[PDB]
Amino acid sequence: TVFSPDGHLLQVEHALEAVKKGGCAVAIKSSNFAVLAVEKKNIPKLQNPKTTEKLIKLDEHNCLAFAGLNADARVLVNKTRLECQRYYLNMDEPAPVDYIAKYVAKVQQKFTHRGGVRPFGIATLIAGFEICIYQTEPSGIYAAWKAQAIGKNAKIVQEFLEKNYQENMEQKDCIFLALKAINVEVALLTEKDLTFIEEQEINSMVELIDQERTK
Amino acid sequence: SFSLTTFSPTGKLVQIEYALNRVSSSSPALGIRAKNGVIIATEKELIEENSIFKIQQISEHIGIVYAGMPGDFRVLLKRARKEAIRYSLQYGSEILVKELVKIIASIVQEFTQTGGVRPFGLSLLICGVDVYGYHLYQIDPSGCYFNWMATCVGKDYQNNMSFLEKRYNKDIEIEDAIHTAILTLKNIEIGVAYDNKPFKILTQNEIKDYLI
Amino acid sequence: YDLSVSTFSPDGRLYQVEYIYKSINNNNTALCLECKDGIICCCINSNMIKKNSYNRIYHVNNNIIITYSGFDGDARNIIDRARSEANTYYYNFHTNIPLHILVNRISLYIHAYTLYWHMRPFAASIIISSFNEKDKGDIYCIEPNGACYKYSGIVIGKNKEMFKTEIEKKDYKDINVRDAIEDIYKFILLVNFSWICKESSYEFQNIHEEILTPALNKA
Amino acid sequence: DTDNIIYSPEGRLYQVEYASEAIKQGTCAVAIKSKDYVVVSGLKKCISKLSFPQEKIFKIDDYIGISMSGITSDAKVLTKFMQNECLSHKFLYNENINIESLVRSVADKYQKNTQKSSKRAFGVGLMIAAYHNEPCIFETRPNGSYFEYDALSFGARSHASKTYLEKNLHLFEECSLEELILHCLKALKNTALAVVGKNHPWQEISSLQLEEYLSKVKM
Amino acid sequence: YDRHLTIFSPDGNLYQIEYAIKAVKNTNITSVGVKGENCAVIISQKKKLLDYNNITNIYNITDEIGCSMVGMPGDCLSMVYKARSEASEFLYSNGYNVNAETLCRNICDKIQVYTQHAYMRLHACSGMIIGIDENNKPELFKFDPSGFCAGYRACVIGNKEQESISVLERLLEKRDIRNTTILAIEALQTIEIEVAIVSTKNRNFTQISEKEIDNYLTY
Amino acid sequence: VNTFSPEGRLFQVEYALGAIKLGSTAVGICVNDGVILASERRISSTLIEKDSVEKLLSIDDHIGCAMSGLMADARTLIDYARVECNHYKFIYNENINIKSCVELISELALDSRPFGVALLIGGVDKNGPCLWYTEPSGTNTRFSAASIGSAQEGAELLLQENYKKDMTFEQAEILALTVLRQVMEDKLSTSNVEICAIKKSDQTFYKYNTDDISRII
Amino acid sequence: GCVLGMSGSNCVAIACDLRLGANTFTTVSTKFSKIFKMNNNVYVGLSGLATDIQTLYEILRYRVNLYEVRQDAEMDVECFANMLSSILYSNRFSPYFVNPIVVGFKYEPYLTAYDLIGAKCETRDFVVNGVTSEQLFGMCESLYVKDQDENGLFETISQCLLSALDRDCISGWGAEVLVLTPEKIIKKKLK
Amino acid sequence: TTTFSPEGRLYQVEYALEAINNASITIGLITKDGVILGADKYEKIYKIDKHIFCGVAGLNADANILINQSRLYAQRYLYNYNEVQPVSQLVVQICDIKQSYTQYGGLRPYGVSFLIGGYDTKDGYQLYHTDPSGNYSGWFATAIGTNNLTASSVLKQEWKNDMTLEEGLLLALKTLAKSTDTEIPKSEKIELAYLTNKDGEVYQKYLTEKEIEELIKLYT
Amino acid sequence: DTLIGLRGNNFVVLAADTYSINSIIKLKNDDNTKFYDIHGNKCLLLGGSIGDRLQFGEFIRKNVHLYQYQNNTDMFVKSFAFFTRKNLAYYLRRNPFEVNCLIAGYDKKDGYQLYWCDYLSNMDSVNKGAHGYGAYLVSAILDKYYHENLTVDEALDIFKLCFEELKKRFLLTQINYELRIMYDNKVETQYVTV
C-alpha cells in the first residue's frame, strides 16, 4: 500500500496480526532431525474436520508449517509446490531449503510491493536439509533459527522455550521439548523425509506431560 | 476494475436492492401458465406505439417482458437472442427455456459482481416452450431466476400479485385464462405460446375480441 | 460535482470543462483577422532571457494555418495531431486536406478527452484557417469540448472581448488588401502577424519584418 | 481536488504548479550565449564533508549538453531518453540530431507526463545548451512549454543571477570565451562549468585549470 | 457518493441521466420534427462575426436519413459521426441501407453503454431521425440520453418539449409538402430557421431550399 | 502515490525516508587500499542460528552492498541488481563499473510502493575502490566514507573525526571498527559485526572470518 | 477402422472390429474397442486414426456430461450428432482422420454418420464408416430387411461383419456387436 | 477487496459471512449408504457430477456461478485424467477461486457458503463446507444457514457415526423440523436428498417422503 | 532400443535395453536409464530419441509428483497413462515427440496395470508389449510362451528367451538389460540381467 510518515507500512503491520492471533506452531532443530509441532482446535465429534491442519510436505525432503489464514496458506503452499517442482525440473535435483525459503520470501514480499494485491495474512516456517530451519514473516523477511514459534502468544511459548533450550538431542526426546513449549499436530522431519507421527505413539508421553505438570 | 457494489455491514448488497426498488417503481406485466399454454401481458399522442412492445421474440418459442429500464431490456434481449443463436449453432436443436434463463441469469450475475458497472435495472418474464412443457421463468436483477405458475413485476403489484391464481382453479384453458390476465391487469400487449410452439401477439382488434 | 471532467452537475453544466474557458480567458490573445483578399492570424505573446522569438502560429500545410491560446503544451501537441492528420490524409487521398474536415477532426480529438474520467481535457482554444481564390477564407475557432465554428474573424485569448469592438468593424476589416495590419497595430492599444492572400500565393507565410516596419512606423 | 486530472475553479492545475515548488530547492545554474559559443555553469551541492558533490552537467551528444535542476531521478530519466533519442536519430539518418527537434521531443514527453493523471509531472526542468549550427539555449518548464533563451539562470537563489543578467548583454563581450566565462562566474557568484561552440563541441573544464580560472573573478 | 457517478439512488432512481437531460433541456435550441403525409419535415432555429451560413442542427447520415441533434455540440458531432459509421458498416455488411430504426439501434445502444459503465460520461445529446423505410411509410424516430428508440408521428426537442406537445396537437388535428412544411415552420412560430424534408426526391433527404424558406413563412 | 506536496517535495518518497532509520547500522569506508564494510551483527535474537544472517551481501564478485531499512525490499533490490549487473557481463569479461551498477539500481529505484531501503554499494573497478550510497529517493552519491542505519545519525561525525584518504585497508579496518563499535551496546565481537572488504589489489569480495575480527580486537 | 450400425423395428445394433494395428498392419493390439456409450440411448463408434479417436470420444465425454448436468434432460441424438459435426469442423487437422458413427433411440431409432470434416448423413437405416466400408455397404445393402427381431438382425449384422472381416487385412478379431432396446442392452463377442 | 482490520480482520468477508448466516438453513449427514443433505427450500441442492452433489447457502444467485464453475472443474479433471474427480480436490478448486476473489481483484467476494459431499472411492463418502473466506473443513454433520449452532447442537448432542439412511434422515429432520416447526417443513417447502452411489433419489412429493412426513407418528 | 513389458497377476515386469546410440550407425553410449520410476508403484519405459524421452519423461515425472504432493491420493495408474496420453497427444501433429512408452504400475483396486503407447499418441491396455524395431522379434515369443497365470520367474525365463533372441537375430544387443519388477511392496531392478 503506502508509507505512513513514520515510514512503517500499514497493510503489513496489520497483516501480521492475523498471525499474532492464530494457532500456535513451533519447530525444534538438530543435525539430521527436527520436530515440527503445531496446534489446531476442532469440534470433537468431527475427526475428519481438520486433516488439513496437518503439517504440509512440499517435497519428500522438505516440510512446512504455518500459522494465520488457511485460505491464504493453501495458495502460498501450492505456489511453493509448483516451485519446488520447477526447480527440481530445471536442475534435475531437489530444492534446498535455502532456495525455497528465498522463493517464498520473494513472493510474500512481492505482494506487499506490487500493486493490485492484498498482502498475505500468514507466517510460515520451514524445515529441510545439514538440516536447517527458516521462518518467513508476512513482511517478506526470512531468517534461520535454531528454534522458533509462530502463532498466537508465540512469545510465551518461545521465551519459555529459551529457558529450556538444548541443541542436539534424541530422535524421540527432542520431541518432548516441542510439547513442553506447546490437541497436538505433531510431525517429525527426519532422514530428509517428513512424517505424520502416529497418534497412539505419543500417548504415553501425552500422559507424562499431563502429570509431570501435576506431579 | 472496481465492483461499485460492495457488501453492507448488514450483509446485503444495497445497490442491487436499489435496482429492485426501481423495478418495483417501474411498469407492470403479467405472466400466467395455462396447462396447455402460456400468456404474458403488460400495461404498455404522436408516438406510434405499434413499434413499441415490452413483449419480444427470443425464438419461435420464447418471449419476454422486462419491467425496468427499456434500454437495459434492449441489451439483455440482444445478448439473449445471440445466445439462443449461439446455442442453436452449438447444437442441432432449439434451446430449452430453462437453459436460456440460466445463461441470462449468469449474464445478469456478472455485472452485479464484475467491476465498474451499474447492475441491471429490470426484472424479466420468459414464457416459452420445450419438450418438457410450457414454461414461465421470472428473472430477478440479483441473478435469482425462478419458476412461476404466474407472476407480476411492475408498479403497485403488491395487491395485484394475488389476482392471478384463479385461472388455475378451473380456467386452465387458454381462452378462459385470457380473462384472468386482462382482468387481473385491469394501453396493453399480449403474447401467447399456445398448443402450437409458435407464439404471436394479439392485435388490438383481438384485444377487443376479448373485451366483450 | 466540479471534480470531474465527466460527471454532470446537478444543473447539467460541466464545471471542469467550464474552467478551460477561464484558462483560455487569462491566456495570451491571438486574434485572427480576415481580409476580403486573404487571412491574417496574429499573436501577441507576453511571456537577459530571449525576446526574439516565440511563435504561436504554425501550419499543417503550406496553406492551412493554426493559432491558439491557453496552455502552450497541449496546443503544441494538438498542432502535432493536425500535422499527422493532414499527412495521413495526404497518404490516403493524394491531395491536400480540405480545411473543413481537418477542423472537424480536431473537434473530435479535443472532444475525446472530456469523456474520460482519468483523462484531462486540453486547455487551448484553436484557430484554424485557409484562404484561396476558390477556397474562400474561413476562420474556424475551436473551443475545447467541441463545437468548432466558422468565423469571419474571431479574437481569442485574454482580452479578446475588448478587441471585438475593433474586429466588429469587420466591414473596415474586410476593406483591406494588405493594410489591415497597420490598422491592427493601433487597434490593439513577440507579436506574430502572417499571410494567406493572393499576394501570399495563398501559401502561409510569416509576414516580412520590413513589411512589419510600415505598420509600426505608420503611427 | 488533489490530482492533475482536474482544473481548479480558478482554472489552474495545482500539481504541475507544484513542480516549481520542487525546483526551487535545486541549486542554481546559469548560462551565457556568445554569438558562436555557449557556456553553462552549475553548482554541485555537497551533502557531507566526505561526499563528493554530484554533477549537474551532462553531455547528450557531440555538440549538445544539458543541466537539469530538479529531482534527480526524473532528470536522469530525461537524460537517458534524450540520449537514446539522439542516437536513434543518427542511427536512422547518418546525421546529427536537430537541437530544436530534440527540445520539441523532450517537451512532448513532459506534456505526456503532465497530462495523464496516473503519471506525475516531472519535478525537473532541463536547460539544454547546444547547436547544430548556431548556438542556442532552451529551457523546459515542467510542462509542455519550452522557450529559447539568450541567457538563463535557475534553481535556488538564482534570483541574484536573474537580476544580474540585466547588467550585461548576453553578448556584451561575446567575442572572447574568457570574457564569456568570466561573465558566467560573475553571474553565478566542486562547483562545475562547461563549454560548447564552434570547433570544440561540448566540454567540461572542471580541470584544475578551471581551479585556476576561479581566481580570475577575484584576480 | 451516488450523485458523483452513474449509479442508483437510495430511491432506486438514476441521477446523472436526469442531469444530462438538463444539459439538453438547458441547451435552449428547440427543434420541431413533424412527419408529413407521405413525407417528413425536421426544423430547427439556427442558433456577430459568427456565420449563420455554417450553423445547423440537422445533419444527414446517409442519403435517405437525416438526424437533427440537440445537446452538447461535441457529443452531437460525435454521435453523428458514429451514426454515419453505423450506416456504413450495415451497408457494407448487408448491402441494404438502414431503416431509420435500425440506425436507432446503434444510436440508442451506443448512447446506452455509457449509462451502465460508470467511467465515460452519459451522453449529453438527443435528436430526431428521419428516413424512408423499406416499408414505403416514412419513419421518424427519436432518442434520449437515457436509451430510447422512441417512436413518433410528431416530436419536439430542446428547451421546449412536452410544453409544445399540446401545441403540436392543434396541428395534429390538421396533420403534401405545402401542408406539412407549413405545420413545421408554424410550429416554430407557434412556440433563419432551417427546414429539412426527405421527400424532395421522395427517398433522398435534403434540407429545403433557401429561396423557398420565405414563401411558406409568408403564406 | 505521486501527489506532489504544496511544499513541493514529493509526498510518498519523503514519507518513505523513515524506513532506513529502522535500519541497524553499517559503516562503509572507501580507502586508498580498498573498501571496508562493517555492520551490526548484534541484531541477532539469541535463538536464531548464530551469525547466520548477513546485512552485507555481494551483487557481483567484486561488489559488496550493505543495506538499510526493510530487509525485504533490500533483498529484492539485491536480487535484480545481481541479475542485471551480471547480465552486463554476458560475453565481455568486464564487470559493470560500480558507478553504473549503482546507477542501474537507482534508476530503477526511482519508479507499487517506493523502496524503504538505502544501500551502500562498494567495489573496485576503476583503479580505486568505489563507495556509493543509494538513497531510497533514487538520488545516488559517491561518498569517500559513509554510514547507514539510524546510528549513522551521530556516528557519521566520527568519520569526519578520522577519515584520511591515506590508510592501509587494515588501518581503515581499525577506523571503521572504531566508529561502529562506538554505537553498539555490546562490547564488539564477531557476533557484533559482519565486516567485509574489497581490496585494491585482490579486488575480491570477502567477509572476514570471525577469527580475524576476534584477533584485531 | 471398421464400424457398423444396423437399425431395427424396436432396436438398433452397432458393431466393430477389435484390432488396432499399427504401420504395415502388424497387430499391436486386439482388445481395442471403438464403440462407446455417451448415454443409455446414445452411442458413438469411432474409426480412422486411434489417437484422434480417444481424443474425440474424450471431448464428447466432457461436453455431453457437461450439458446433461447443466441441462437435466439426457441429450437427444440430434443434438449430440449435429454438435459432433460442429466439433470436427473447427479444424481438419485435429483428426488426421476419424469417422464417427452415431446411434440410438430418440423411441424412434436414430442412425447418423459423420465424415471427418463433419459432413454428415442422417440415415434412416444402416451406415458403415470404416477402412473396410465398401465390403460393408456391399453386403448390408442386399442382406438388409426393413425390420427384424433383435437376434435375426444380430445374425444379419454379424454376417456383414463375418463377411467383411475376411476380405480386409486390417479387419479385427472378434466383434463388439451391441443390439439394444430402450430398456435393455446386449453386447456380445463373436469369433 | 478491502484491506485488513486494524485489530486484524477482514471487513468484506465478515460482511458476506453476515449474509450467509441469514440464508435459509441447509444441513448435512454421513451414513454408511452415502451423504444425505437437507434443505429449507427452488431445488437449493445441485449435482456436481454423479458421485458428487453440493447443497448451498448464501446469496445463491452468486452460488449459481460456483455450481457452473464446479461442474467445469469436475468435467475438466475427467478431461485430463480419465478419472472422475475426488471430492477433496473439487473443494480445493472452488476454494482456490474464492481465495482468488478475496485477495487480489477489486471485485467483491462471493456471497456464498456451501456444502459439498460425494463418494470418491479412495476416501469413502466425503462431506465438506465452504466459506467466502476460503476456509474449508471436512465434517460428519453440519447445519449452515440460520440457526447454525441451534440446529447443529441438537445433532451434536444427539449423533453417532453410523445409522441407516431410513433412521438417519429422520434425525436430520428432528433438528431441521423442530427448529422451524414440528411439522411445517413437510407441511411446506423442503428438499432432502442423498447419494446411495449416485443421485438424490428422495423427492418431497415422493412416497418415501411420506416417511419423513411420518416421522411425527414416530415423533408423537 | 528395444523395449518390453509383461503383466500378470503376480507381476508387472519391464525388461528393456540399455544401449544409447549417438549415431545410428553405432551404439557409442551405453548403460542408459530408459526407465523412469514415477510412482511408488509405476515405472515408465520410454524410447526413441534420448532427448525426447528425457524431456518428456522428466516432464511427466514432475506433473505426477506434483499431482501427488497436491492431492492426498496417489495417481491411479490409468490416470497416469491417460495423462501421459493427453500430454503426448497435446502436440499438434507438427510437434509430437518421437517417444514410445510403456506405462506400468500397481493399484489398490485394479492391481497390476500396463499401457502400451506410441510415437503417435495411440495407447492401449495389454498383457504384454514391445517397442523399437525389436518389437517384431520378441512378440512372437511373448505371445507363444505366455501364461496368463504364470509365476514371475518363469516370465523371467521368457525374457531370457526374448533377449537371447534379439542378440542372435537383430541389431545385436548383448549388454545387460535393466528391468524393474513390480511387487505388492516395491519395484525390483536387475541391471545385471544378461
Side-chain angles (χ1 to χ4, degrees), chain H residues 4-6 8 10 12-13 15-20 23-31 33-39 45-49 51-61 63-67 70-71 73-75 77-95 98-121 124-147 150-156 158-159 161-165 167-173 175-177 185 190 192:
Chain H
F4 297 84
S5 175
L10 279 70
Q12 293 292 315
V13 176
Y15 298 159
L17 175 65
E18 183 69 21
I20 73 102
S24 67
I25 188 166
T26 185
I27 66 101
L29 296 177
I30 290 174
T31 63
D33 188 9
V35 181
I36 186 170
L37 194 148
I45 292 176
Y46 297 136
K47 293 184 74 66
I48 300 304
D49 298 346
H51 64 293
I52 293 176
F53 66 82
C54 58
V56 183
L59 299 173
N60 297 128
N64 195 29
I65 301 305
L66 293 175
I67 310 306
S70 301
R71 294 175 183 169
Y73 293 103
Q75 297 304 322
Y77 178 80
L78 178 57
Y79 175 98
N80 289 275
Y81 295 92
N82 196 338
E83 192 269 335
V84 293
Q85 193 171 358
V87 177
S88 301
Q89 284 175 328
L90 177 57
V91 182
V92 168
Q93 296 301 317
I94 300 168
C95 292
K98 294 180 178 297
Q99 175 58 63
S100 296
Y101 290 86
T102 70
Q103 188 172 349
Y104 59 86
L107 303 177
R108 64 173 184 82
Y110 290 100
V112 191
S113 300
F114 57 85
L115 277 69
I116 171 168
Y119 175 69
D120 52 347
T121 59
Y125 298 94
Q126 295 288 312
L127 176 62
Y128 294 88
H129 175 56
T130 53
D131 289 337
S133 170
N135 298 122
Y136 65 94
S137 296
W139 289 95
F140 294 98
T142 57
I144 309 304
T146 296
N147 285 337
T150 303
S152 297
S153 298
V154 183
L155 288 175
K156 184 179 184 293
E158 297 298 323
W159 183 84
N161 286 343
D162 173 62
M163 295 297 179
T164 67
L165 69 88
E167 184 170 4
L169 61 85
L170 305 176
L171 186 62
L173 291 167
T175 67
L176 186 145
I190 181 173
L192 284 65

Side-chain angles (χ1 to χ4, degrees), chain F residues 59 77-78 81 85 100-102 104-106 108-109 115 119 121 134 138:
Chain F
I59 289 173
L77 289 179
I78 310 299
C85 293
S100 297
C101 187
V102 187
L104 296 183
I105 302 166
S106 294
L108 174 61
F115 294 90
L119 296 176
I121 296 170
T134 292

Side-chain angles (χ1 to χ4, degrees), chain G residues 64-66 68-69 73 75 77 79 81:
Chain G
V64 173
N65 285 335
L66 178 58
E68 293 176 350
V69 184
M75 184 177 288
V77 177
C79 294

Side-chain angles (χ1 to χ4, degrees), chain B residues 9 14 23 30 69 97 104 160:
Chain B
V14 179
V23 177
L30 276 67
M69 299 182 70
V97 174
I104 292 174
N160 186 28

Side-chain angles (χ1 to χ4, degrees), chain E residues 138 140-141 143 145-147 149-152:
Chain E
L140 173 67
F141 294 89
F143 58 90
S146 172
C149 298
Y152 295 102

